[PDB]
Amino acid sequence: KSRQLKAAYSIELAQDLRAVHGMDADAELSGILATEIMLEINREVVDWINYS
């Protein structure tokens, strides 16, 4: 079965972030999304353990 998500963002946001924090924000989003998937699967395993 699959899992997957998208970035949901735009250029103006990045422009502001470059000025505000000095962030590119692409990797930031990718890392976040990666993180969510890995954590969610982790829960998936634990929760199924608890279930079963």
Binding site: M38, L39, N42, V45, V46, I49
Partner: protein
């Protein structure tokens, strides 16, 4: 995250695999209602089978 040191993985190089299981049985019909297993960790009791 407690990634996978609390569960098995058995990673695959393809989707949707299969796993085989073996059971020793008795009563001349391995597939039947009432069929009995020969070995089981919760009972292995049948001291009357080859006997009286």
């Amino acid at each position: 995250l407690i990634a996978f040191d609390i569960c098995g993985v058995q990673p695959m190089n393809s989707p949707t695999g299969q796993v085989f299981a073996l059971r020793a049985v008795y009563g001349k019909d391995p597939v039947a209602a009432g069929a009995k297993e020969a070995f089981h960790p919760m009972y292995g009791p049948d001291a009357m089978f080859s006997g009286q």
